[PDB]
Structure formats: C-alpha cells, structure tokens
Amino acid sequence: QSYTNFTRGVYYPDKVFRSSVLHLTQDLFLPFFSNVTWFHAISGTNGTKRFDNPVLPFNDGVYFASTEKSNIIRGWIFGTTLDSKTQSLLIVNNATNVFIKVCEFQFCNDPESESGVYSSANNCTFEYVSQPFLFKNLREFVFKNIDGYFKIYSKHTPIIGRDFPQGFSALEPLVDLPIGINITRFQTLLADYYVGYLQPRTFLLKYNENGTITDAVDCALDPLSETKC
Amino acid sequence: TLKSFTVEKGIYQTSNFRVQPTESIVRFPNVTNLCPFHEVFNATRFASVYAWNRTRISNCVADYSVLYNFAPFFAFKCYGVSPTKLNDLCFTNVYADSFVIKGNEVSQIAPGQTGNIADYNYKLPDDFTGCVIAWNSNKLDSKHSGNYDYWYRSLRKSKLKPFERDISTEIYQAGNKPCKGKGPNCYFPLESYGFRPTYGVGHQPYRVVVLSFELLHAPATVCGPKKSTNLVKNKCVNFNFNGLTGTGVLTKSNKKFLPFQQFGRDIVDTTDAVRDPQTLEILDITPCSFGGVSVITPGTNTSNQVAVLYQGVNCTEVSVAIHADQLTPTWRVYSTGSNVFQTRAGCLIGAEYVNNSYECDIPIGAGICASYQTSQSIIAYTMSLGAENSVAYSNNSIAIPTNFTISVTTEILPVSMTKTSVDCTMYI
Amino acid sequence: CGDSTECSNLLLQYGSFCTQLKRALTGIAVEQDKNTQEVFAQVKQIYKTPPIKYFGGFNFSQILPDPSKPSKRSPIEDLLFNKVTLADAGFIKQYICAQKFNGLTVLPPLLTDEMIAQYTSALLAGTITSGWTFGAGPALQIPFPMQMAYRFNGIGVTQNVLYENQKLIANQFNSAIGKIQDSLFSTPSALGKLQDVVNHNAQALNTLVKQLSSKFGAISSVLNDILSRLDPPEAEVQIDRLITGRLQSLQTYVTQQLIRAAEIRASANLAATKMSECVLGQSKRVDFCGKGYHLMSFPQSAPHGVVFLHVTYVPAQEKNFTTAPAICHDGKAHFPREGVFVSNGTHWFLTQRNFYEPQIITTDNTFVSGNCDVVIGIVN
Amino acid sequence: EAEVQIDRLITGRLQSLQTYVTQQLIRAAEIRASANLAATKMSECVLGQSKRVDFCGKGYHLMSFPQSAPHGVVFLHVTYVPAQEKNFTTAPAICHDGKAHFPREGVFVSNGTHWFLTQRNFYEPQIITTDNTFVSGNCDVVIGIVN
Amino acid sequence: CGDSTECSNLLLQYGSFCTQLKRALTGIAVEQDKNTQEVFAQVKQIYKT
Ligand SMILES: *[C@@H]1O[C@H](CO)[C@@H](O[C@@H]2O[C@H](CO)[C@@H](O[C@@H]3O[C@H](CO)[C@@H](O)[C@H](O)[C@@H]3O)[C@H](O)[C@H]2NC(C)=O)[C@H](O)[C@H]1NC(C)=O
Ligand SMILES: *[C@@H]1O[C@H](CO)[C@@H](O[C@@H]2O[C@H](CO)[C@@H](O[C@@H]3O[C@H](CO)[C@@H](O)[C@H](O)[C@@H]3O)[C@H](O)[C@H]2NC(C)=O)[C@H](O)[C@H]1NC(C)=O
Ligand SMILES: *[C@@H]1O[C@H](CO)[C@@H](O[C@@H]2O[C@H](CO)[C@@H](O[C@@H]3O[C@H](CO)[C@@H](O)[C@H](O)[C@@H]3O)[C@H](O)[C@H]2NC(C)=O)[C@H](O)[C@H]1NC(C)=O
Ligand SMILES: *[C@@H]1O[C@H](CO)[C@@H](O[C@@H]2O[C@H](CO)[C@@H](O)[C@H](O)[C@H]2NC(C)=O)[C@H](O)[C@H]1NC(C)=O
Ligand SMILES: *[C@@H]1O[C@H](CO)[C@@H](O[C@@H]2O[C@H](CO)[C@@H](O)[C@H](O)[C@H]2NC(C)=O)[C@H](O)[C@H]1NC(C)=O
Ligand SMILES: *[C@@H]1O[C@H](CO)[C@@H](O)[C@H](O)[C@H]1NC(C)=O
Ligand SMILES: *[C@@H]1O[C@H](CO)[C@@H](O)[C@H](O)[C@H]1NC(C)=O
Ligand SMILES: *[C@@H]1O[C@H](CO)[C@@H](O)[C@H](O)[C@H]1NC(C)=O
Ligand SMILES: *[C@@H]1O[C@H](CO)[C@@H](O)[C@H](O)[C@H]1NC(C)=O
Ligand SMILES: *[C@@H]1O[C@H](CO)[C@@H](O)[C@H](O)[C@H]1NC(C)=O
Ligand SMILES: *[C@@H]1O[C@H](CO)[C@@H](O)[C@H](O)[C@H]1NC(C)=O
Ligand SMILES: *[C@@H]1O[C@H](CO)[C@@H](O)[C@H](O)[C@H]1NC(C)=O
Ligand SMILES: *[C@@H]1O[C@H](CO)[C@@H](O)[C@H](O)[C@H]1NC(C)=O
Ligand SMILES: *[C@@H]1O[C@H](CO)[C@@H](O)[C@H](O)[C@H]1NC(C)=O
Ligand SMILES: *[C@@H]1O[C@H](CO)[C@@H](O)[C@H](O)[C@H]1NC(C)=O
C-alpha cells in the first residue's frame, strides 16, 4: 500500500528554455524516496464495490500516476467539502474530449459499459473543453494549486515497461486553469493508481542539448546530493 | 582621456564602441478584442466590499484611455508601476476587484494600513503591484431611504489574508457562551452602512476598482496598443516582443523549444531567444557588436596621425557599421585600402601592414606591434625576437675567450613609498 | 548601465571609480606581458641547433622543436599545450556561449605561443651547444660531453666519471626524458598548477556576469524594465540601487584580480630566477632546481606558464667503508686534499666524496699539518 | 531628509577611503617584495661575491656598489664579460703511454700543431704535464681521446 | 543575519557573495596547510638519531 522508491515527479517549472545546463530551482516537487501510497487494496470494481474509495488530502499539490490499461479512472474531483456548500472542480476525461468544469456539484456518480456520469451542477463558475487524453503506456500527472491557478502537468509515457519505475522522464505542463479555487481534498473518479504529495524543495535539474530534462538531484535527500547541488 | 594637450608615444585605451540600432520592432499579439474595462468600470452595480467582484481579464488588448474617458478620478494609487502610462506594458495576469467603499475608509485601501477594511474586509499584499482607482459614486449609489445592499465585516476572529476570502456568515462567537442566535452581546457581523445623498463627503460611497498586475516579462500577455511592424533579421535593432524590451540582432534559431516554451536563457540568466507572438517562430538574440577602442599615437611632438584599434571585432563588421553610420563614436578615420588590417586583438585602421620585422615599439597584441617610420606614417608589423646566431657546434671544437670586458650595469629597486595617514572623521 | 543614458548620468555622480578600475585592469594587463617577457625573453639572440642532432649520444628530440608538426614545438611542449588548453575563449581569436560579452573583454597576450616557443628553442639551443657561456657573454661552442664533464666537476664528481660512463649517462638521460613524457601524458593532474589559474580567472568573470541578474533590493534587475515601468523620479532610485550593487561587484572583481596579479607576479619572478640560475647556469642551491645535485635544466613553454625539466645527479648503491680523519705516517698527520680516507677492511684508499673510486694514498693527494698526537682517531 | 543625503555622502566617502587603503595595502605588499629583493641583493652582491647567474647583473659577477635614491636603492654591478673568443680544436683526454690523462683544471686546446691546457675562461696555453693533469683508466675507454 | 528567514530572503538578492567568501576562506585555509607542508614535509623518510 506504500511504495517507498519514488524518484519521479520532476516537471518543467517555467516557460524558460535551457540547453546543456544544470539549473538549481526552488519549487514544489515530490521528494525523492518519499513514501507514496499505492492504491491496489481499493482499486477497481473489486476494490471499491461502490463503496470506500477514500477521499485524500491535498497538501500544496499532488503527484498522480495510472497504470490501468482499461482506463477505469476517468477524472478527478477537487474541493474542500464536495457537497455543494463550496465550489468544486471536475476534470473528467471522455474518450472524445476532456471536460473541465467548476460548479456546486451536490451530486456525483461516486456513491461495465455505460457507467453513470451524472452530476447536478447546481451553480457553475467555470467551463473548459480540450483534446482527449486517452501496461504499454504509463500516465503521470501533477496537480498543484498556486495563487489562483490550477496547474496540471502530465506525461503519457509509452513505457512493455510494466515495472513502475522503469526510467526517468520529466513531465510537461498540460493545462493551466485560471481557477480561484480553495482545494484541501480530492477524490479519484472511476467509471491501479499511485498518489504522492509535493513539498517545497530545491532541485538541480539537468537540461540536455535539446532542452529536455534528463536527470535531477534532490538537494535535501543525502549529503552527496547537497554536495552535487 | 589623459587630461593633457601633449600625448606620449604609445597605445591608449579610450571609450568602448557599440553598433547602434537602426530600427524599432514592436511585436504585440495580433488581438483586436478590447479588454472589458468599460463593462467593469461603467457597471450598473458594484458588489459589496464583503465579497468584491473579482473579474479576470485576459486574451485582450489593454487600453487605459477608457479610464480617462470614463471620469476624472479621486486617485489612481499605482504601486510597483507608478505611472498611469500603462499602455506600453504587457501583463501576464490582470484582475479587477470591484467594490463600493465609504470615503473615510478609502485611505484604508493601501497595501499596508490599519482599520476595519484593511484588517477585516479587503487585504492587499504589502509588496503588491497594481493600481487602486477610485471614483465618486454618490450620484448613483446613495438613496434617500438609504442603500442597504452594502455592508462591512467589522467583527472577525482573525485578520484577512491577501486575496483570500472565506465568505461564511456564521455569527461571531465571544466569551465562553456559544452566541448562537441574537440576544447575547454577540452581534451579526455585517455593518449595514447606508449611503445617503445628504451625507458629507467622508460618508459618501466611492466605487474603487483594484487592478492587480502580474509583470513577469511576458509568458502570457494582456498588451496595450502599439502599431506592430515586420521582422528584419541579421541587423541590430531595438525589439519589443510583448513586454520583453531589449536591443540586439535577431536571427533564426536552431534551438528545439517545447510547444510550451516561449523564451530562452543562457547560463548567466540572460535572454537569448524569443518566440514571435504572430508566427511562433523561435528567434535567437545576439548582442550587437561592441568592444574596446584603443588609439596608437606616435606622440604629438612628432606627428598628429593616429591609428585606431577596434578590439574584439572582425573588420567586415566595422566597415559595415561605418558605412551604415551605426558606430557609436562619431569620429571617423580615412579607412582606405592598405590601411585596414585584421589582427587577433581586433581591427586596426590607420596603419599599413608590412612584411618586415622590427623590434617592438608600440605593442598592439598577438605579435603585431606598430611604429612611425618612413614620408613618415604609422606601420604595423610582426615583431622581431632577436638576431639569429647559429653556433658552430662540433664534436671537437671549443671557443675560448682571448680578451675580456669589465662591464658595469645599473639595477634600480624601490625600497619604500610615501607614508600617509588619514583623519577619517575630518575627511568624511 | 548598458544602453541606458539615465543610468549613465546617475553613474557619473559617483566620481572617478571607472578611472580607477580601468587603470587597475590596464596595469594588470601590462604586467602580464612584462612577466612573460621577463621569464622567456632572457636571450640576446635566437640560437639554433646544428643540422646534425648528435650530442655525444644524448637524445634531445623530445625537447627540441619538431620541424614536421605545425607551430614548431617540441613533443613535450605540444603535449603540455594539448593538455591544459581547456579555455574556449582565452583570447579574442578575431571574434558561457556568449563569452561573457557584457562589457568584459579578454585581451590577447603580446607574445603568441609560437613566439614563446621560439624563445624556448633559442634557450635550449644555447644551453645544449654552449652550456652557460651564452648566459654571461657571447655563446661559446663546447662539445656536449665536455659540458657535462664540467657540470660533473660542478657537483664535485671528477671528469673521468662521465667519460668512462658516457654511454650509461646518455642512456639514463634518454630514459628519464622518455619517462617524463610518459608521466605527463598519463597523469592529467600533473599540470594542475596552471589549470587552476585558468579556472580561477574563469570563475572571476562568470560570477561577475551572474551578478547582473541580482536585484540588490530593486524591483527588477533589468534597467529597461525599470525605465519602462517607473517614472524618472522613482526609476532613479531603483537604478541607484542597481548601480551600487554592480559597482560593488566590479570593485570586488578588480580587488581579487589585483591580489591574483600579485601572486602571479611572484610566481613569474620565481620562474625568471629559476631560468636565469638553472637554465643559463648551474645552481648550487639545494632543491632549488629538482631533487639531487643539479646538473642542468631545460625550459618548456606551457599555456600561461613555464615547465622546467631539471636534470640532476642522484647517488646510488652506497657501500659502508671504515674511515679516519687522517693517516699517521713517520709521525706526520696526513689529511686528504679532495676526498675521504676509506678502508675496505685490509687496505686504506683515498676516494672522492660523491663516487667510490679508490686511490692509493700518496703525498700528491694529501697534505701534512702537525704530528700524529693532535688528531683524534688518526690511523696508522 | 538631510539625514538621508548625508548618509549617502558618508557612504561615498567611506567607500572611497576603503578603496584607497586597499590599494595602498596591495602597493605596500609590492614594495615589501621589492625591498626584500633589494636587501637580498645588498647582502649577496655588495657584501660578497655571488655565483647566481644574472642575479647581480649580466656576466660573471665581480662586485657591486650601492647608491641611494629617493624611495629606493640603485646597485652598480661590476661583472666580467668574455670577449674576442677564438675557436680551438679540443679533446676530452690525451693518450700518452696507454694512460688516459684528464685536466685537473682547464680544457685541452689545439692550434692545429700543438696541444695545450688552458684555463676555461681565458686563453692562456700551458704545456700539458703530469702536474696539470691526472691519470685514471687507459686509452681504450674514453671516446675521442687523442695521442 | 543569524536565525532570521526574512533577512535570508533579502540576502539572496545580493547574488553569490556568500559563495565567494566561502571560496576565498577555503582557499586561504588550504593555502595555510600547503605552506606548513611545504616548509616542514621536505623529507620523504623519518630519520632517527
Ligand atoms: C631519439 O629518441 C626518439 C624516441 O624517443 C627516437 O625516435 C624513435 O625512433 C624509433 C626507431 O626505431 C621509432 O620506432 C618505430 O616503431 C614503430 C613501431 O612501434 C615502427 O613502425 C617504426 O618504423 C619505428 O621502428 C620510434 O617510434 C621513434 N619515436 C619517436 C617519438 O619519434 C629517435 O630516433 C632518437 N634519435 C636518435 C638520434 O637516436
Ligand atoms: C681491498 O682492496 C685491495 C686492493 O684492491 C685488495 O687486495 C688486492 O686483491 C686483488 C684480488 O684480485 C689482488 O689481485 C691479485 O693479482 C695478481 C696478479 O698477478 C694475482 O696473481 C692474484 O692472485 C690476485 O688476483 C691484489 O694483488 C690485491 N692487492 C693487495 C695490495 O693486496 C683487498 O683484497 C681488498 N680487501 C677487501 C676485504 O675487499
Ligand atoms: C702552435 O703553438 C706552438 C707553440 O706556441 C707553435 O710553435 C712555435 O712557433 C714559433 C713561431 O711562431 C716558433 O718560434 C721560433 O723559435 C725558434 C727558436 O730557435 C726561432 O729560431 C724561430 O725564428 C722562431 O722564433 C717556436 O719555436 C715554435 N715552438 C714549437 C715547440 O714548435 C706553433 O707554430 C703553433 N701553430 C699554429 C698553427 O699556430
Ligand atoms: C702508530 O705507530 C706508532 C709507532 O710508530 C705507535 O706509537 C707507539 O704506541 C705504543 C702503544 O703501546 C707505545 O708503547 C710506543 O712507545 C709508541 N711509539 C711511538 C714512537 O710513539 C702508535 O700507537 C700507532 N698507532 C696505532 C693507532 O696503532
Ligand atoms: C695512439 O698510438 C697507439 C700506439 O702507441 C695506437 O694504437 C695502435 O692503433 C692501430 C690502429 O690505429 C692498431 O693497428 C695498433 O695495433 C695499435 N697499437 C697499439 C700498441 O695499441 C693508437 O691507435 C693511436 N691513436 C691515435 C688516435 O692515433
Ligand atoms: C522498489 O521498487 C520496486 C519496483 O522497481 C518494487 O517492486 C518494490 O516493492 C519497491 N520497494 C519498496 C516499495 O520498498
Ligand atoms: C534532438 O532530438 C533529435 C530527435 O530526432 C535527435 O535526433 C537529436 O540528436 C537531438 N539532439 C542532440 C544534440 O542529440
Ligand atoms: C456608461 O455610463 C453612463 C453614465 O456616466 C451611462 O449613461 C451609460 O449608459 C453607461 N454605458 C454603458 C454601461 O454601456
Ligand atoms: C462581476 O461583474 C461583471 C459585470 O459585467 C459580471 O459580468 C460578473 O458576473 C460579476 N461577477 C461576480 C462574481 O459578481
Ligand atoms: C479553504 O478550506 C479550508 C478547509 O478546512 C478552510 O479552513 C479555509 O478557511 C478555506 N479557505 C478559503 C479561502 O475558503
Ligand atoms: C494572428 O496570430 C495568429 C497566431 O497563431 C495567426 O495564426 C493568425 O494568422 C494571425 N492573424 C492575422 C490576421 O495576422
Ligand atoms: C660526431 O661524430 C658522429 C659519429 O658518428 C658523427 O655522426 C657526427 O656527424 C659528428 N658530428 C659532426 C658535427 O661532424
Ligand atoms: C569576417 O567576416 C567575413 C564575413 O563574410 C568572413 O568571411 C571572414 O572570414 C571573417 N574574418 C574573421 C577573421 O573572422
Ligand atoms: C651497510 O649500509 C647499510 C645501509 O642501509 C646499513 O643498513 C648496514 O647496517 C651497513 N652495514 C655495515 C656492516 O656497516
Ligand atoms: C673554427 O676554426 C676553423 C679553423 O680551424 C675555421 O675555419 C672556422 O671558421 C672556425 N669556426 C668559427 C665558428 O669560428
């Protein structure tokens, strides 16, 4: 239920192109070898059984990854209460398009084809539609809520690479939603997955000739990492 | 440079040269959608201070002449970007916080200040950039019976965090009694202030809009108006790419930017690339050529002819800058054929290079020295190291002196220097 | 205040700080050429070796210029050059990928590497052909084995030792040169003393450029942004804050360059002293020019410096002998004129101090002063 | 406001003094190094005869004389410079009765008809005798021995 | 400014000053050990009377 060996979650912190450099930056990152919870005990149909599927806290930001070929995970819900008392953000990934909405979702499908996706959306403040996102392809996402913006980063790495830490790759920003939303908890929406949490850290990021991040050092992990930084 | 009307023989370091720009390039987004300031400033109603109307403005052209057309203002209160000449900037994020406040609390809207508004209803960051723009709305918001659609949260448990609001209306609790309902000395939080047309100026309503500006070069833009022009490459120009202003030479880049990325940086955190907002082409920015200038003078007691060394550049670029009237120093030299020579140090103009070697006189660098020789003109040459003297080495030959010279030489060494003392207090 | 006239006008109010910094850097730049000239330009004339590179059997092919390869440098000089030239922009070259082009210009040396190589070649040809005579007056040719014989006398070893062992000495010299070349080739750290100098100067410039990105209390580190966003009366405050920070950074750079210049000057003066005393002569100063008794030295050029090959005589294979301060004969005390009395256990001989070569004790090798009673430990 | 303007002037003057003193300390170190060299030269060139090449001027050192100067010292170095050399034929040893004869001092030279021993730094030919040379080994060991 | 976060955040606006001082003092410390080693460690063997 807890996988200790996580060295992934590095993402491009800004719009700055760098080439053949090592850049030291302070941002929210998943710490290296931080305890990360693996939700295999309560996974799919035989996990939740239309029950449990616990709501997790959202401390500064989270790291999410999926290894489920069937795409049972369709989206995420974010907010503080999630019963219409406060606003909540939904990002459901449909096969045709990704539908991101911010509304007072009193009702949701959360308590095998044509599963229910009903929501009440009693009052809406934001709507956005984008290209669809949809084993041999591991899907990594980072979700952080900073200064009124919900920043989503991802990588649909084609890696057939079944071992979870098969290799290192940095995530690229996917969308930056201008949502002034207070987020303290979130839940995974199903029609397995890993969830880790971000902390403020300083990292040394290695940019290659093409400006792709190929490695990183977590400056607080070990005396050797401090020496490298 | 030497503060003298007499110059000794030698090479002297003078001011540096730069290639001047010849064009001004503005590349703002090709957006004709005017930012909705009129709909916010000229609104039918403003929200109460309790829950100000926060309108996000993006993907539009900022125009602040709308504000001068709207009304004369009480105050702009611009911080971080002090002038009202905001049409020259590109902002990453723009927020318009709209509310109606009473006159005696307008002064409470500063980034750092005290009072019931500054402390409990609307809080700005102390390092905030933006403008707080006020308008007198007595003629619109005041009513004879009183306009009771506005209130203040004067009773609060804790200080309001900047740009963060919890709009719960739960009655304030005090003491060890729950204070659930009316009757105890705990009162409902909102003030209920009523704006009357018969009130004095300090009690009249004002419509205040806070324009929060995020200036971070230009990873995103809300740009003011300018008339854009075409790109000209391989020339020194003054460019403005959205809010990124600078001078340089724009060339095609060979960098592979991510679709996400717009700007590049070198190892010294200086801009070295930009994505063009109208074409999405990635351009390299090269500094315009510059370098030191040195003057080689035989000495004014011999000749007034001098040679000029432009350090750090190729003579092709110097000749182009002279012909284009781009070179920063306004003086010129004849620059005729046979008087331009490329050295490792730079471009030497005003000296004729010869294939003879001589002892070095005025050093230039990388082996090239110059002197004034015959009719007389400044020449440049590769310095001689000494005379050659092959020695007749043999298996069985030795040279033995037969005579000698008694030589006296002079060696001079400093031993001491002037001893000084300073009265720190009297001096300063 | 790059391309900003408001900033330049404010900078003018601080006085002659630029004059002092410019003059300090100019003085350093001139001093570096003085140091190079003092170390290498010690020869009145450019001396050349004979067409026939035969010097008693000594092989100098790895220290003499190689006429085939471009630059006319020796194999060792070429190795030193290829090993330490890790600076991408150590001089203008008729032209950090930007090479610190933020108003910071690197100047070329006055003497190029080929001209320094020519001075080194002249010094080597002089030393090989004429020993130390070219360093005092005119060059006087001498056969190399005789030059070595007199250097052996210089270290207290009789001339016959070289001639009897000339083949041994030439082979040991040639082997030592080959070993030196292989040692320098296979040990990248050997030249660290010169590489550190290059690295320190690179750091000095890299940091100075990086200081431009600092705000020093200003709202922005970019003058164009300050002027665009602020009206003149506030822009002047933010600009003064940046002027103070950048000017302090320049003063720090110049102070450290002056200190480093003093260190380099001291090193150059030491190098010039070593060249004058060990290349143009034979030194008697212990460990001044290598371990062992000094015989000769050979200069080699290197980027930003000089490498000396010091050829010394090292005693080997010592044996224990019984000694005595004097010999008692006919009541007289006989002392060595040039040597030590030794015994192999049955017979007494007189030998030279630096090489066992037993002689018969005779009246032509000793002197007499006093009787046999005054000397402590006298042997019959 | 005067407090602000005065503090700016104080900062400028104090920084100017720090710059002056730092440069004076560096120049003082340079002068100290020069003075130490001058004292060494005084001790080794004036109070004795030096064998260090080019330490006490060009040529072979004979003696030096100090002279004072403002803020410093001037040394007059008197040296011996060889002149008017002649090129003679030489040999490492003379072979006589099978013995190899080496010079005690000097070098063997020849004018083309006779061999002489001469002091290395001044041509002054002497007859080669058993008092001027020493014997070690024989004529079959030394390379280039002449009869 | 010891044990103060606010001053540390302002101090970071002056650049690499602290790094330059660390390099200068470390270089001095190493130089002093080099000087002692160069003066006294001139013999490769420990001789005894
Ligand atoms: C002075 O010493 C150098 C070496 O330090 C001599 O040059 C060397 O000469 C030998 C001659 O046999 C070269 O050997 C070569 O070996 C290769 C195979 O390894 C063979 O294919 C060649 O045909 C040749 O036999 C050796 O490479 C060469 N080394 C260098 C660095 O040049 C030089 O000849 C000596 N001079 C005198 C006058 O003794
Ligand atoms: C100390 O040194 C002396 C002198 O070298 C040694 O005495 C010498 O020993 C050699 C040994 O070969 C004697 O050589 C003799 O030559 C004749 C030639 O006809 C031969 O017939 C003999 O059989 C012998 O080989 C030499 O004469 C002799 N000289 C004297 C004066 O005794 C001595 O042995 C050495 N002692 C030690 C402990 O090393
Ligand atoms: C090499 O040097 C030797 C000796 O210095 C030269 O031999 C000497 O040459 C001189 C002539 O210059 C001879 O002088 C003659 O002396 C006799 C004495 O009776 C006199 O009658 C003659 O009129 C003349 O003055 C001297 O005797 C002679 N000595 C010997 C031992 O031969 C030799 O000529 C020199 N060779 C060269 C090529 O320089
Ligand atoms: C060297 O020889 C002399 C004699 O030629 C020795 O002197 C004698 O020493 C003995 C010692 O008992 C005396 O009794 C004699 O009277 C001495 N004679 C003379 C003439 O002095 C001397 O001792 C010898 N030295 C050594 C070290 O053996
Ligand atoms: C010096 O003289 C000796 C003889 O006294 C020469 O030795 C002879 O050399 C020849 C060859 O040149 C041999 O054939 C003889 O057998 C040798 N004789 C003896 C007794 O050794 C010697 O060569 C002469 N050296 C010179 C340089 O002339
Ligand atoms: C370490 O990672 C591997 C996957 O490479 C995983 O199987 C293993 O359980 C991990 N060990 C932990 C979580 O301590
Ligand atoms: C950049 O990516 C391309 C992708 O095809 C690759 O071929 C190229 O080699 C990369 N750049 C470098 C410097 O390797
Ligand atoms: C703008 O304000 C004026 C009053 O100053 C009003 O008459 C006009 O209708 C408003 N126009 C709008 C809101 O479009
Ligand atoms: C703010 O006022 C504008 C005026 O047009 C309106 O469109 C917008 O919905 C208002 N928002 C809130 C949260 O009151
Ligand atoms: C955000 O939600 C948390 C949930 O505990 C609450 O304490 C906090 O006050 C909320 N903030 C805002 C601005 O709504
Ligand atoms: C406006 O800019 C966009 C940028 O992608 C470009 O595609 C479009 O053609 C431009 N339109 C005009 C009329 O310039
Ligand atoms: C010296 O002798 C050797 C013997 O082989 C010869 O090759 C060489 O050419 C001689 N030197 C001169 C200068 O004649
Ligand atoms: C100077 O620039 C021209 C441009 O055509 C080039 O051909 C020439 O080689 C350059 N010279 C040097 C020394 O860089
Ligand atoms: C011979 O010399 C060696 C030198 O290390 C010494 O150890 C040994 O004891 C000596 N033997 C005698 C008998 O003097
Ligand atoms: C050496 O002496 C010979 C005559 O013995 C003469 O021909 C030759 O020119 C001399 N060489 C020199 C360099 O003086």
Numbering used by the authors:
A (entry chain A): 26 to 30, 32 to 65, 68 to 139, 154 to 176, 186 to 210, 212 to 243, 264 to 301
B (entry chain C): 302 to 482, 484 to 676, 689 to 742
C (entry chain A): 743 to 837, 850 to 1134
D (entry chain C): 988 to 1134
E (entry chain B): 743 to 791
What does the literature reporting this entry say, word for word?
To investigate the effects of N30 glycosylation introduced by S31Δ and two RBD mutations (F456L and Q493E) on the structure and function of the spike protein, we determined the cryo-EM structures of the recent SARS-CoV-2 variants KP.3.1.1 and JN.1.11 along with engineered variants JN.1.11 + S31Δ+Q493E, JN.1.11.1 + S31Δ, and JN.1.11 + S31Δ. The spike proteins exhibited three conformational states: “one RBD up,” “all RBD down,” and “flexible” (i.e., one or two RBDs disordered in the density maps due to flexibility).
KP.3.1.1 contains only one additional change compared to KP.3, a deletion in the NTD (S31Δ). Compared to the JN.1 spike protein, KP.3 carries two mutations in the RBD (F456L and Q493E) and one mutation in the S2 domain (V1104L). S (S31) and KP.3.1.1 S (S31Δ) in both “one RBD up” and “all RBD down” states revealed similar overall conformations and no change in intra-domain distances (Cα RMSD = 1.1 Å and 0.9 Å, respectively), indicating that S31Δ and N30 glycosylation did not induce any substantial conformational changes. CryoSPARC 3D variability analysis demonstrated that all spike proteins had similar proportions of up and down RBDs, suggesting that S31Δ does not influence the conformational dynamics of the spike protein. The S31 deletion and N30 glycosylation exhibited a minimal effect on the spike protein conformation and did not affect spike binding to hACE2 or to the broadly neutralizing antibody BD55-1205.19 However, addition of N-glycans at N30 knocked out the binding of the NTD antibody C1717 and altered the glycoforms at a spatially adjacent N-glycosylation site at residue N61. The N30 site (NxT motif) was found to be predominantly occupied with high-mannose glycans. Structural alignment of SARS-CoV-2 WT, JN.1, and JN.1.11 spike proteins with KP.3.1.1 showed that the NTD and RBD exhibited greater rootmean-square deviations (RMSDs) than S2. V1104L has little effect on any conformational changes; V1104 and L1104 are both surrounded by a conserved hydrophobic pocket formed by P1090, F1095, I1115, and T1120 in the same protomer.
